[PDB]
Amino acid sequence: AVKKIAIFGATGQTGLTTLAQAVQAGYEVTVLVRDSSRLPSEGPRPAHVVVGDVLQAADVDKTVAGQDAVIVLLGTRNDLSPTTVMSEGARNIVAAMKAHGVDKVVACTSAFLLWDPTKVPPRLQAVTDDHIRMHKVLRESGLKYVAVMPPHIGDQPLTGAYTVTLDGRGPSRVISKHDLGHFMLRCLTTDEYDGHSTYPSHQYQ
Ligand code: NA
């Protein structure tokens, strides 16, 4: 039974609704944040808050200690420049999970990893390159890794009626940020997605 989880990137749009749903689901949530004031002051607050940076190996190590599973929602703060913050952040998380014996990691990359590499728009190639590096870091770690590769993440409401496509592209090109967080929590209750790539999508319009 998974009870204690750590969430990386909980201050982002998708991370905030994932944190809110995880607290309401009864999980003991630990978050790593740059600033504690970025967390919601009222309502769903996490059980444990570590103030630090994901690129600091020691900060990640104390966040992963004693956890049952890890949710990774790392991004590039809306910067299309060539970067390694997501891949290097993933290497710190993987190193900490191996040392402490944590096996379950659910990580969000991008649906572009399911596309023809030549069809990826050139403007988004730099960010996609680091998503590939992070995915390879997690794929080669040997942990129970659920690769979430969502399409466009919108502001649609929480439905729970989305479609989950395994190891391929789904029929819709949009997933709500609430349904995305809902699905990543669902991956903590089952192992049927372990080692697979998941494409959540739904038709809201
Ligand atoms: Na933060």
Curated annotation (Swiss-Prot):
GO cellular component: cytoplasm; cytosol; extracellular exosome; intracellular membrane-bounded organelle; nucleoplasm; plasma membrane
CDD domains, per database record: BVR-B_like_SDR_a
GO molecular function: biliverdin reductase [NAD(P)+] activity; FMN reductase (NADH) activity; FMN reductase (NADPH) activity; peptidyl-cysteine S-nitrosylase activity; riboflavin reductase (NADPH) activity
Superkingdom of the organism of origin: Eukaryota
EC number: 1.5.1.30, 1.3.1.-, 2.6.99.-
Modification Phosphoserine occurs at: 41, 81
Keyword NADP: yes
Regulation of its function: Mesobiliverdin acts as a competitive inhibitor for flavin reduction, indicating that flavin and tetrapyrrole substrates compete for the same site. Inhibited by a wide range of xanthene-based drugs, such as phloxine B, erythrosin B, tamibarotene, sulfasalazine, olsalazine, febuxostat, ataluren (PTC124) and deferasirox.
InterPro entries, sorted: NAD(P)-bd_dom (IPR016040), NAD(P)-bd_dom_sf (IPR036291), Polyketide_Oxido-like (IPR051606)
Subcellular location: Cytoplasm
UniProt catalytic activity: reduced riboflavin + NADP(+) = riboflavin + NADPH + 2 H(+); bilirubin IXbeta + NADP(+) = biliverdin IXbeta + NADPH + H(+); FMNH2 + NAD(+) = FMN + NADH + 2 H(+); FMNH2 + NADP(+) = FMN + NADPH + 2 H(+)
Family: Belongs to the BLVRB family.
Complex and partners: Monomer.
Protein name per UniProt: Flavin reductase (NADPH)
